[PDB]
Amino acid sequence: STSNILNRLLVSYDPRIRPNFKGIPVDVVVNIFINSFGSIQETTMDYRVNIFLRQKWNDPRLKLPSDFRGSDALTVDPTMYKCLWKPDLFFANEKSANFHDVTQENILLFIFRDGDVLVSMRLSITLSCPLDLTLFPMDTQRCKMQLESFGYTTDDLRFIWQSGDPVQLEKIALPQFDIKKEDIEYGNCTKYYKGTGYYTCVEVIFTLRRQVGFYMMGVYAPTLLIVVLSWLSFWINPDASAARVPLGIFSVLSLASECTTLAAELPKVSYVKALDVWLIACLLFGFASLVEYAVVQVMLNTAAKRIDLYARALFPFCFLFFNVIYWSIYL
Amino acid sequence: MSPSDFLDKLMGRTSGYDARIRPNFKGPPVNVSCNIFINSFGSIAETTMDYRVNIFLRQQWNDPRLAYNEYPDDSLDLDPSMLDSIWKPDLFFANEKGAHFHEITTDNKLLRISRNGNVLYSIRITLTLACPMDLKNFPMDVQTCIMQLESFGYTMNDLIFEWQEQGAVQVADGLTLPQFILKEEKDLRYCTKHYNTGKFTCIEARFHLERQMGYYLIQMYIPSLLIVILSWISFWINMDAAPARVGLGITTVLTMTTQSSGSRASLPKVSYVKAIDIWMAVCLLFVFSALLEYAAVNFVSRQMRKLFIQRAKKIDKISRIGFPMAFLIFNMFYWIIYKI
Amino acid sequence: SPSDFLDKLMGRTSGYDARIRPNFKGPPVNVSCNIFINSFGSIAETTMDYRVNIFLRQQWNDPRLAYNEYPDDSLDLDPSMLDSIWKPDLFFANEKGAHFHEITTDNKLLRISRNGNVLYSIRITLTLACPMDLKNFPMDVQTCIMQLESFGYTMNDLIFEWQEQGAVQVADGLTLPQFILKEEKDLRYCTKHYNTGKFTCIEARFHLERQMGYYLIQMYIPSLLIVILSWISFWINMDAAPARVGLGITTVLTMTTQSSGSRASLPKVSYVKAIDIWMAVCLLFVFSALLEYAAVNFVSRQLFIQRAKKIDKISRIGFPMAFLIFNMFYWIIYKI
Amino acid sequence: MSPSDFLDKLMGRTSGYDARIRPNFKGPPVNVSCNIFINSFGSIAETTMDYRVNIFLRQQWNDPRLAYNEYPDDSLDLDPSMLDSIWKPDLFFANEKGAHFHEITTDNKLLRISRNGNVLYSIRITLTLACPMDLKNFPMDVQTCIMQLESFGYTMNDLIFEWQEQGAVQVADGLTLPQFILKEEKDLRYCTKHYNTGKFTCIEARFHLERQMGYYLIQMYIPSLLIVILSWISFWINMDAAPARVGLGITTVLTMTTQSSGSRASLPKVSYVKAIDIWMAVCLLFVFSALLEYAAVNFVSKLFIQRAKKIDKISRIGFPMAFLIFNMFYWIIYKI
Amino acid sequence: MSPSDFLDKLMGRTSGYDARIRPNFKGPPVNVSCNIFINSFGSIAETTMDYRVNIFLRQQWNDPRLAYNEYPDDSLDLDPSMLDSIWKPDLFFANEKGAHFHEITTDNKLLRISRNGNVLYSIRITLTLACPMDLKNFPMDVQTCIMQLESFGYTMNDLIFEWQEQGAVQVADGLTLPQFILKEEKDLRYCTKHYNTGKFTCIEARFHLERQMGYYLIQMYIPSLLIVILSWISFWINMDAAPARVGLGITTVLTMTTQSSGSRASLPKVSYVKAIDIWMAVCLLFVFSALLEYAAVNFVSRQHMRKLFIQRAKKIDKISRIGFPMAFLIFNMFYWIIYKI
Ligand SMILES: *[C@@H]1O[C@H](CO)[C@@H](O)[C@H](O)[C@H]1NC(C)=O
Ligand SMILES: *[C@@H]1O[C@H](CO)[C@@H](O)[C@H](O)[C@H]1NC(C)=O
Ligand SMILES: *[C@@H]1O[C@H](CO)[C@@H](O)[C@H](O)[C@H]1NC(C)=O
Ligand SMILES: *[C@@H]1O[C@H](CO)[C@@H](O)[C@H](O)[C@H]1NC(C)=O
Ligand SMILES: CCCCCCCCCCC
Ligand SMILES: CCCCCCCCCCC
Ligand SMILES: CCCCCCCCCCC
Ligand SMILES: CCCCCCCCCCC
Ligand SMILES: CCCCCCCCCCC
Ligand SMILES: CCCCCCCCCCC
Ligand SMILES: CCCCCCCCCC
Ligand SMILES: CCCCCCCCCC
Ligand SMILES: CCCCCCCCCC
Ligand SMILES: CCCCCCCCC
Ligand SMILES: CCCCCCCCC
Ligand SMILES: CCCCCCCCC
Ligand SMILES: CCCCCCCCC
Ligand SMILES: CCCCCCCC
Ligand SMILES: CCCCCCCC
Ligand SMILES: CCCCCCC
Ligand SMILES: CCCCCCC
Ligand SMILES: CCCCCCC
Ligand SMILES: CCCCCCC
Ligand SMILES: CCCCCCC
Ligand SMILES: CCCCCCC
Ligand SMILES: CCCCCC
Ligand SMILES: CCCCCC
Ligand SMILES: CCCCCC
Ligand SMILES: CCCCCC
Ligand SMILES: CCCCCC
Ligand SMILES: CCCCCC
Ligand SMILES: CCCCCC
Ligand SMILES: CCCCCC
Ligand SMILES: CCCCCC
Ligand SMILES: CCCCCC
Ligand SMILES: CCCCCC
Ligand SMILES: CCCCCC
Ligand SMILES: CCCCCC
């Protein structure tokens, strides 16, 4: 009849035996369709991808009978994969992954004439990638996606990327990142857990380049404005303490508060980053401005005009020199 | 005519109904007319670019092997404990970003088999959909968030989705939202996907969402206007009060910096320039230029000795009469642009 | 035997099809409901929702469940068998998320009476959603409701009604932070008219008043202190221009910080709240104090001393009365 | 002998053990002696007024139809994967506010059927219980948080709950907490409640939690004493000048306000006044009163100079004594 | 012959294998050798005092009634779908504080029955264990967070847990942690519990975790040092600038108060005094003393036809100016030498 073909195929078909039980390992090809790439969270060293994971192997026990109509493809319901052997492909970077069943369990299953199967189930994997926060506002992170088997050694199961396009993203447009080209290198990733054997592994590496725009609008402009404010504080030179000290005080305090606030979000990594270097240098320039005013006061309490003229001449030059060096080094 | 016998005869053991083959198998694809009902909208997060909708998805296909002749009724009602033994479409929201059913005191499914073969099916889902936002005109944007109904198990030639002709997207009567206000017209386009494994079906609805201007306007424009007027009254003070003018300028600069930092902190770390960012930058620039022109006047007054004081007072008067005019010009120029 | 009685009443040797309503092809079976609020609380403002831990009960009439062996009238049963009985499928129209409770066993109760009445009491935990009106935010009177509503049948097949006496019971020790629950609880009707037919619905209203103590103290006393600080800023020598302008500065900064905190503690609603007006008026008073001092300085710098002192004195004797009259009007309008 | 056959005969398919009817049916009720074992207490969330406990709830009733004579052993241990086919008590926590089992590598249950019929049952739950808290003496409070074990399906006439006679509530030896400390003596009373549907048995245990002063004491009181000493030193300046007196004073008030905001940011929106609030307000009042005194002295300021200096001296001598009297009175009030 | 027949004969319908009785029933207890494989640490929170670990628990007991002889292979591999029908140990973590399995595209179990009867069993767990921390030397502390494998359903005389002799706790190759850095030596003590019901076996491993000082050092010591130098440059000014110096002192005192308040935002409300609270208190005290000495100098200068008051005020200013920095250096040396040993 209609379903009698699949009933005949699955009768006497033990789902607890892999294809070619005593023969060669089954070659499973893997294809990934990134439906939506999520936002990477620097706080917890992780991001949330949403993929249409696809697998395709050869099962000789599932050859379609010669009485089957239709050219090649025999699609079945999503509620029938329970009776078919499936590779135990799991993600080695997952933190808390999830299935997807909004109306029915989202799993597709094609069967061809030669016995090939195609499971294209949908996942919501939440990977974790260790970031490198050196050169923080201008960095290019590489976040991975490791797929590997669990219960079968290399003698039984192995994963090979599809010869076409293993990744088929079309439009992503991350809020603060942009991915253009990625490498599928380390194709082979086979791990060797001690005393257990060789386990197949495949790996995809992305290149999450970070856009500078927000940070160039976030700290660069306010900090430059405060430094120029300190410069014009040099400019007046009224020798009035109540009008000259508060400018340097406000510059130093604003730099300190801005640094603390902007660093209160990133993960507590322990090494100097570009943002910290910039903040420290600008805060040091403000403090040096205040020390310059102090030395003017002590020398005036050879004249203060000469030293003030020298300062007004040299601090803008020194700041421009530092800015050029910083941008050239970090770009 | 016992109800127990009739249900078993129509589906189950003594029926011959295989709930694994689609209606009209090996033939034309089966249409699935869909019509959602927005029970409760809202929870429009900005950071995660997602909104939570509580729909009531309905769909009615045509299964020819479910027709009955015993009961004279046409709109026969069935059990939410029975529809697990009949074939159903498997539409999934392509941007669901997480979803869950609802089960309180019983499941939340409705089944209604018609006389000819039409089968109504209405479940209650609570999606948390994802829609990318364009925050260029952030305080006055008109967002467009969408949902994409689409199956997962069949090909284009096996299962057709269409919207209902009349009244496809209904809305709860007393629905209201914070901030945004939901429009009346809802576009119903086609979103048919071409994946690597064949052409698949995709029907989508568009909800056009405006943004109310009250909270943003008040809480991030009135303080800015007040601080700018404070800078102007800093202009309108004695020239000799150097510490007073310096302190007032410093306070205005600090207030603008803090307000800009606070305004930037409620939105995702987007790259481009927003609409409120231009306003905050211009206000900060005006405050800084005000303090800088005070600094220039103070420098000029120091370095004909009497002529320098006269020109310093002239510059101060020109500033006090011109700045406010320039700010008014900027205000009109800005408001006329972001309202068109 | 008790096992044989249960088997013949329900299950294998019973013939009870647990899929057909009682009184089929006839009048609808009314289901009398009565909740019992075990523990209220967790009224969040940002998410515009509250959590209630109800002890829902309902008792319909099933004619095909009568028994004659036991002389007892209220025969109690095992919560592991009430899954083989037709049950109403009521759902909360604004549940926004809910779950059962299963600790050490399920948390259901079944009790079949002699004539056929069947009690059914489960312990659910809802997090219901209620739209709020924050116009009079420090002194608002919320009205958050729950809507019991059927989903399976049309009105002609299932009707929901409340009990005549004690429909909504409240735990004796039920206490809340901030809000205090009223005593009267309205029991209205919410008959829905969907596109698929009429579905029965019953709703209960909880009148929730808000205690004014914490809000009063925290965001009213500092405002009065800052206003009095500006008033004593009037009470200082005219020559102390830097001191007066700095004190005006710190008053303005304190008002700005407090306004930012108050606006950030609440959801970003479009309209103006009752406390935002207070903050705005206090900030306007402080800003006008700074403005009038600058005006006095300008007049004095340009007989001028006498008129400047007269302006200062009239300001010092005039703003306190204006603030008092504003306070009286505000409190009389927002307490009626 | 076949243990499989013995188990099947005792219960299961070929046993006739209907696991849906209470032991001693239509007869006397069965006591369920309970004795918990707190593995890990803590997480005293003050904002949400709840705490998390990880108990090892145990209970042992008497089932006459489980008596066996085949095996010679008495304390026969069973498999935690097959105890779902016997009668089990259905106690629930009346204020659980959500709870879940633990299933790691296997279920976390234990079963032990004695020879006479005693059946041990020890599951591993993780509750997050709810206890209303009273914060009148906020830093020196003695909280009382409780857990209410209570049955759900059966009536008081069909069931009795009792605690174990000796060592009812055991505590892990290495248990420790931040902030609070768990007392050794615990109260175990009865909570037999009368719902609308009948009397349900209930047993509750009381946990007494003191509060360590260490963090609060230091970080909320030592800065206050330092600022008060600073204000006294501000008194100890001569005619000096504006900054000497005003400045010292201007910092003092500014820091004591910072102290205010700090003591404020960590508690729920409670209405009545806390205990730390009284101290913080009095410290702010002393700073403000010192500033007001300084002002009045400045307003007064050769005979007027003499009286102003005498007022300053009597202030510098009297204010420390008044502060000491207030401190002693406050501490005696809050330490009795 | 038939693999399906072999599987059914070994366990299932035609087997007689009851998966409810422990191996060596009514005999010696069955030892279960355990060895975890830490895949990744992370999320070592201070607020809740817990750390999330993604372990790869393995164990191997001896089941006599699983022996086979027809197949020549010794390390016969089975599926993670049919291991539910065999007896398994029920070890639980005494301080798991919540945990869950991993189920993606399948389960994440493994079954490997050896020739003699040894049965490997390697599931993938994601624990969030609870470890009470000691924050005395908070920026320079060394933690010791532990996990305790322990059986619950059986008795010490019916189930004993032991670690493998060689390679008991493996570590992922490229494993790294933010903040903390993991040591190499890990202790393996014993944990035999004595509950009310009797003796239950338990075995624990200790992970020694040091803390990196980079982030804390930079962004909670550099601002304090800079503010102290700010007080010093306030010292380095003439005494006529009374409003300027008093304003700077006010700002610095407020800054130290705010920084000390922001110190405790990310730490639990622990009772005793920490390591860095002493540093913050000393910095606040130094700023406070700077303002205090300015007040004293103003008092001395204004106490005044003699210039001796001005001369002694200038001497006081100079001696404090040259002395404070030395006192700060002495305090810094003492603090570092006593908190780095
Ligand atoms: C990967 O290396 C492993 C280990 O030698 C080997 O078994 C396997 O053939 C290799 N596979 C690929 C894809 O190169
Ligand atoms: C709708 O159903 C009919 C009958 O099965 C089919 O012929 C038609 O192709 C389907 N929809 C479309 C327009 O493809
Ligand atoms: C304890 O259990 C027995 C069982 O028959 C019952 O009669 C008695 O009332 C229960 N309560 C007491 C007194 O412990
Ligand atoms: C487990 O080791 C103990 C200790 O020697 C021993 O009694 C027992 O024989 C071992 N396991 C077996 C084989 O039952
Ligand atoms: C997307 C380019 C942004 C360039 C920098 C803009 C700075 C604006 C603010 C200047 C004070
Ligand atoms: C209904 C529109 C309301 C717009 C905001 C009005 C604010 C008025 C007060 C400003 C201080
Ligand atoms: C962990 C190494 C610490 C080295 C000493 C740092 C001293 C910093 C303060 C210098 C004044
Ligand atoms: C983790 C290495 C830290 C090296 C010292 C950094 C010092 C930065 C501040 C310099 C003023
Ligand atoms: C790990 C090396 C640290 C060197 C000393 C750094 C000092 C930075 C602060 C200088 C004021
Ligand atoms: C002022 C000196 C600060 C650095 C002291 C370093 C002491 C030795 C540390 C060895 C780990
Ligand atoms: C790349 C080395 C950075 C060293 C610390 C920062 C130095 C700042 C100098 C202005
Ligand atoms: C470990 C004992 C702590 C006692 C309270 C805090 C004392 C602080 C002294 C500076
Ligand atoms: C308004 C709160 C009064 C609390 C009791 C009295 C406190 C006296 C402190 C000196
Ligand atoms: C929604 C229109 C707002 C217009 C504001 C104009 C403000 C002019 C100062
Ligand atoms: C056990 C703590 C004692 C704290 C004494 C503080 C004394 C301050 C003057
Ligand atoms: C902290 C800055 C001290 C600057 C001293 C300058 C001395 C010049 C002779
Ligand atoms: C137990 C910690 C003692 C810290 C003493 C610090 C002394 C600094 C002078
Ligand atoms: C991609 C933008 C870089 C801008 C560098 C700074 C130019 C002044
Ligand atoms: C202000 C100088 C910016 C230089 C950017 C780098 C150019 C190669
Ligand atoms: C905004 C300042 C106005 C001053 C007017 C003085 C007459
Ligand atoms: C003064 C600018 C008015 C703009 C009105 C836009 C509707
Ligand atoms: C879109 C850019 C608008 C600039 C306006 C400047 C007044
Ligand atoms: C009901 C609260 C009244 C407060 C009055 C404050 C002056
Ligand atoms: C009912 C409250 C009246 C307050 C009046 C305040 C003047
Ligand atoms: C209890 C230890 C106190 C140390 C104080 C150091 C200043
Ligand atoms: C720190 C800058 C000093 C400049 C002296 C001319
Ligand atoms: C800010 C620019 C200053 C230039 C002085 C020659
Ligand atoms: C896009 C550039 C905007 C500049 C505003 C001053
Ligand atoms: C702010 C502009 C000042 C120009 C002085 C000549
Ligand atoms: C601030 C610039 C001043 C220029 C004087 C000629
Ligand atoms: C905004 C330009 C102001 C110019 C004043 C002279
Ligand atoms: C608000 C505009 C004021 C202008 C004064 C000259
Ligand atoms: C009952 C509230 C009292 C508040 C006193 C400031
Ligand atoms: C409803 C508006 C009230 C305004 C009081 C000043
Ligand atoms: C127990 C605390 C005493 C504090 C005395 C000032
Ligand atoms: C200052 C007196 C404290 C007394 C504590 C019992
Ligand atoms: C004055 C009361 C003293 C109490 C000592 C225990
Ligand atoms: C803390 C510094 C004291 C200096 C005394 C001369």
Which of C118, A100, A301, E285 is CA-nearest to residue D197? Answer: C118
In order of A139, A177, B270, the CA distances from A211 in angstroms are 9, 6, 9
Distance CA D25, CA A274 (A): 77
φ/ψ (deg, to 5) at E255: -65, -45
In this complex, how many residue pairs, one in chain C and one in chain D, have their CB atoms less than 8 Å apart?
99
Using most ligand atoms within 8 A of CB, pick from E213, E336, E339 the residue to mutate for ligand 10. Answer: E336
Q: Parallel, antiparallel, or unpaired for β A157-161 and A26-31?
A: parallel
Q: Are the beta carbons of E260 and E286 closer than 8 angstroms?
A: no
Which tokens hold the place of D196? Answer: 């609308």
Which tokens hold the place of A264? Answer: 């209160």
Least Cα separation, residue D18 to chain C (angstroms): 7
CA atoms within 13 A on the CB side of C311: 18
Q: Which residue has the tokens 């309490």?
A: A301
Spell out a b/e string for C2-39, using b for 16 or more CB atoms within 10 Å of the CB, else e: eeeebebbbeeeeebeeebbbeeeeebbebbbbbbbbb
Distance CA D180, CA D142 (A): 9
State if residue B28 touches ligand 31 by the CB under 6 angstroms criterion: no
Which residues have CB under 8 Å from A99's CB, separation 6+? A105, A106, A123, A124, E103
Which residues from chain D sit within 8 angstroms of residue E257, using beta carbons?
223, 255, 258
Which tokens hold the place of D100? Answer: 């879940």
Q: Which method resolved this structure?
A: cryo-EM
Q: Are the beta carbons of A6 and A81 closer than 8 angstroms?
A: no
Find the residue in E nearest to A266 (Cα).
E215
Torsion, CA C277, CA C282, CA C286, CA C291, rounded to 10 = 30
Which tokens hold the place of C113? Answer: 């009476």
Q: Parallel, antiparallel, or unpaired for β E91-93 and E142-151?
A: antiparallel
Least Cα separation, residue C218 to chain D (angstroms): 9
Q: Parallel, antiparallel, or unpaired for β E142-151 and E202-211?
A: antiparallel
* Ligand 9 geometric centre to CA of E337 (Å): 16
Domains of chain C as residue ranges with CATH? 2-211 (2.70.170.10), 214-333 (1.20.58.390)
Find the residue in E nearest to D233 (Cα).
E292
Q: Which residue has the tokens 């729950």?
A: C146
SS3 call for D33 = strand
Is residue C36 within a helix (H) or strand (E), and if so which, with residue range? strand C36-37
Pick from E75, E77, E84, E105 the residue to mutate for testing the A interface (most A CBs within 10 Å).
Answer: E105
B126, B223, B244: residue with CB nearest C242: B244
Q: Which ligand is nearest to the CA of B326?
A: 31
Q: Are the beta carbons of B107 and C89 closer than 8 angstroms?
A: yes
Distance CA A55, CA A166 (A): 11
Q: Which residue has the tokens 């005194």?
A: D293
- Write the burial class of residue C53 (CB in 10 Å: 0-12 exposed, 13-18 middle, 19+ buried): buried
SS3 call for D37 = strand
Instruction: Provide the 10 A C-beta neighbour count for residue D302.
Output: 4
Q: Whose CA is nearest to atom 7 of ligand 21?
A: B339
Chain length of chain C: 336
Q: Whose CA is nearest to atom 8 of ligand 14?
A: B331
Q: Parallel, antiparallel, or unpaired for β E169-171 and E44-45?
A: unpaired
DSSP state of D129: E
Computed over its alpha carbons, how large is the radius of gyration of chain A? 31
Which residues have CB under 8 Å from B4's CB, separation 6+? C17, C19, C20
Atom of ligand 16 nearest to the CA of E233: 1
Contact E39 A130 (CB under 8 A): no
Spell out a b/e string for B277-314, using b for 16 or more CB atoms within 10 Å of the CB, else e: bebbbbbbebbbebbbbbbbbbeebeeeeeeeeeebee
Atom of ligand 13 nearest to the CA of D273: 2
Which of C134, C105, C135, C139 is CA-nearest to residue C122? Answer: C105
Which of B317, E245, E297, E276 is CA-nearest to residue A293? Answer: E245
Which tokens hold the place of D222? Answer: 């030592």
State if residue D330 touches ligand 13 by the CB under 6 angstroms criterion: yes
Instruction: Provide the 10 A C-beta neighbour count for residue C309.
Output: 13
Q: Which residue has the tokens 């489980």?
A: D66
In this complex, how many residue pairs, one in chain D and one in chain E, have their CB atoms less than 8 Å apart?
157
Contact C108 D153 (CB under 8 A): yes
In order of A69, A161, B196, E255, the CA distances from A114 in angstroms are 14, 21, 20, 76
In this complex, how many residue pairs, one in chain A and one in chain E, have their CB atoms less than 8 Å apart?
152
Contact C105 D89 (CB under 8 A): yes
Atom of ligand 4 nearest to the CA of E62: 13
* Ligand 18 geometric centre to CA of A173 (Å): 21
State if residue E179 touches ligand 7 by the CB under 6 angstroms criterion: no
Distance CA B233, CA B229 (A): 6
Distance CA B196, CA B193 (A): 10
Which of A185, A118, A184, A191 is CA-nearest to residue A154? Answer: A191
Chain C residues at the D interface, defined by Cβ less than 8 Å, are 2-3, 6, 34, 36, 38-39, 41-42, 53, 55, 57, 76, 78-81, 101, 103-111, 119, 121, 123, 125, 166, 169, 173, 175, 177-178, 211, 213-215, 217-218, 243
Chain length of chain D: 336
Instruction: Inspect the structure and tell me whether chains B and D have 3 or more CB pairs less than 8 Å apart.
Output: no
B62 part of contact set with chain A, CB < 8 Å: no
Q: Are the beta carbons of D85 and D11 closer than 8 angstroms?
A: yes
Which residues have CB under 8 Å from C317's CB, separation 6+? none
- Write the burial class of residue E123 (CB in 10 Å: 0-12 exposed, 13-18 middle, 19+ buried): buried
Spell out a b/e string for E35-60, using b for 16 or more CB atoms within 10 Å of the CB, else e: bbbbbbbbbbeeeebbbbbbbbbbbb
Which residues from chain D sit within 8 angstroms of residue E93, using beta carbons?
104
Distance CA D224, CA D236 (A): 18
CA D292, chain centre distance (Å): 43
SS3 call for C231 = helix
In order of C264, D141, D144, D217, E269, the CA distances from D211 in angstroms are 32, 6, 12, 11, 11
Distance CA D183, CA A238 (A): 68
Signed CA dihedral, E42, E48, E50, E52: sign only: negative
Pick from E123, E239, E250, E286 the residue to mutate for testing the D interface (most D CBs within 10 Å).
Answer: E250
Backbone interruptions in chain C following residues (C to N > 2.5 Å): 302
Q: Are the beta carbons of A296 and A308 closer than 8 angstroms?
A: yes
Distance CA B205, CA E113 (A): 55
φ/ψ (deg, to 5) at A181: -130, 140
Mind giving me the DSSP string for B199-253? Answer: EE--EEEEEEEEE--HHHHHHHHHHHHHHHHHHHHHHSS-SS-HHHHHHHHHHHH
Q: Whose CA is nearest to atom 1 of ligand 28?
A: B273
Contact D195 C79 (CB under 8 A): no
Which of E255, E282, E278, E286 is CA-nearest to residue E139? Answer: E278
Distance CA C18, CA C2 (A): 21
Distance CA A207, CA A180 (A): 8
Q: Which residue has the tokens 């007494």?
A: D208
SS3 call for D310 = helix
Identity of residue E186: K
State if residue D226 touches ligand 12 by the CB under 6 angstroms criterion: no
Identity of residue E54: N
CA atoms within 13 A on the CB side of D188: 18
SS3 call for E38 = strand
Which of A214, A212, A219, A213 is CA-nearest to residue A283? Answer: A219
D80, D214, D244: residue with CB nearest E299: D244
Chain length of chain E: 341
DSSP state of D190: E
Contact D197 C103 (CB under 8 A): no
* Ligand 2 geometric centre to CA of B32 (Å): 10
In order of A5, A236, B239, C63, the CA distances from B315 in angstroms are 96, 16, 11, 98
Mind giving me the DSSP string for E95-161? Answer: T-SSEE---SSS----EEE-SSSEEEEE---EEEEE-----TTGGG-EEEEEEEEEESSS-TTTEEE
Task: Identify the chains in contact with C, defined as 3+ C-beta pairs within 8 A.
Answer: B, D
Which tokens hold the place of E3? Answer: 């693999």
Identity of residue E180: F
Which residues have CB under 8 Å from E29's CB, separation 6+? E156, E157, E158, E159, E160
SS3 call for B158 = coil
Spell out a b/e string for B20-52, using b for 16 or more CB atoms within 10 Å of the CB, else e: ebbbeeeeebbebbbbbbbbbbbbbeeeebbbb
* Ligand 14 geometric centre to CA of C272 (Å): 16
Q: Are the beta carbons of D64 and D87 closer than 8 angstroms?
A: no
Distance CA E173, CA E170 (A): 9
Task: Identify the chains in contact with B, defined as 3+ C-beta pairs within 8 A.
Answer: A, C
State if residue E319 touches ligand 38 by the CB under 6 angstroms criterion: yes
φ/ψ (deg, to 5) at E232: -65, -45
Distance CA C202, CA C32 (A): 11
Which residues have CB under 8 Å from D288's CB, separation 6+? D253
Signed CA dihedral, A121, A124, A130, A133: sign only: positive
* Ligand 15 geometric centre to CA of D45 (Å): 28
Resolution in A: 3.6
Distance CA E123, CA E100 (A): 11
Instruction: Inspect the structure and tell me whether chains E and D have 3 or more CB pairs less than 8 Å apart.
Output: yes
> What is the CA angle B159-B164-B166, rounded to 5?
170
DSSP state of E301: H
Please list the alpha-helical segments (H only) found in A179-303: 213-215, 221-236, 241-263, 274-300
SS3 call for E291 = helix
Identity of residue B204: E
Instruction: Provide the 10 A C-beta neighbour count for residue D143.
Output: 18
State if residue B296 touches ligand 22 by the CB under 6 angstroms criterion: no
Which residues have CB under 8 Å from D203's CB, separation 6+? D34, D148, D149, D150, D161, D162, D163, D188, D190, D191
Mind giving me the DSSP string for C171-216? Answer: -TT---SSEEE-S---EEE--EEETTEEE-EEEEEEEEEE--HHHH
Q: Whose CA is nearest to atom 6 of ligand 38?
A: E320
Torsion, CA A145, CA A146, CA A147, CA A152, rounded to 10 = -170
Distance CA A145, CA E124 (A): 18
Straight-line distance from the first to the last Cα atom of chain A, in angstroms, rounded to the nearest whole number: 69
Q: Whose CA is nearest to atom 4 of ligand 28?
A: B278
Atom of ligand 34 nearest to the CA of C330: 5
Contact C152 B80 (CB under 8 A): yes
Distance CA D190, CA D161 (A): 9
C235: left (phi over 0), alpha (psi -120 to 50) or beta: beta
Backbone interruptions in chain A following residues (C to N > 2.5 Å): 301
Q: Which residue has the tokens 């991030």?
A: B220
Distance CA E216, CA E222 (A): 10
Which residues from chain A sit within 8 angstroms of residue B50, using beta carbons?
none
Identity of residue B72: P
Identity of residue B282: V
Q: Are the beta carbons of B31 and B62 closer than 8 angstroms?
A: yes
Which of D206, D200, D227, D210 is CA-nearest to residue D286? Answer: D227
State if residue B235 touches ligand 31 by the CB under 6 angstroms criterion: no
Which of E189, E182, E95 is CA-nearest to residue E142? Answer: E182
Contact B106 C97 (CB under 8 A): no
Which tokens hold the place of B227? Answer: 């601080």
Per DSSP, what are the bridge partners of residue C145? C205
Q: Are the beta carbons of B45 and B178 closer than 8 angstroms?
A: no
DSSP state of A46: B
Q: Are the beta carbons of C247 and B251 closer than 8 angstroms?
A: no
> What is the CA angle B184-B185-B191, rounded to 5?
135
Domains of chain A as residue ranges with CATH? 4-210 (2.70.170.10), 213-330 (1.20.58.390)
Atom of ligand 24 nearest to the CA of C328: 7
φ/ψ (deg, to 5) at E265: -65, -25
Is residue B322 within a helix (H) or strand (E), and if so which, with residue range? helix B305-337
Distance CA C307, CA C304 (A): 5
Chain length of chain B: 340
Distance CA B92, CA B80 (A): 20
Distance CA A194, CA D216 (A): 51
Signed CA dihedral, C214, C220, C224, C230: sign only: positive
Which of D18, D160, D155 is CA-nearest to residue C76? Answer: D155
Instruction: Provide the 10 A C-beta neighbour count for residue E165.
Output: 8
SS3 call for E61 = strand
In order of D117, D149, E59, E174, E189, the CA distances from E166 in angstroms are 47, 48, 14, 21, 15
Instruction: Provide the 10 A C-beta neighbour count for residue C213.
Output: 14
SS3 call for D187 = strand
Per DSSP, what are the bridge partners of residue D156? none
Identity of residue E56: F
Which tokens hold the place of D89? Answer: 């008590």
Torsion, CA C164, CA C170, CA C172, CA C175, rounded to 10 = -150
Which tokens hold the place of D328? Answer: 């002693």
Identity of residue C192: K
Q: Are the beta carbons of A34 and A49 closer than 8 angstroms?
A: yes
Per DSSP, what are the bridge partners of residue E122? E58
List for chain C the helix, strand, coil content (%; round to 5). 35, 25, 40
- Write the burial class of residue D171 (CB in 10 Å: 0-12 exposed, 13-18 middle, 19+ buried): middle
Is residue D31 within a helix (H) or strand (E), and if so which, with residue range? strand D30-31
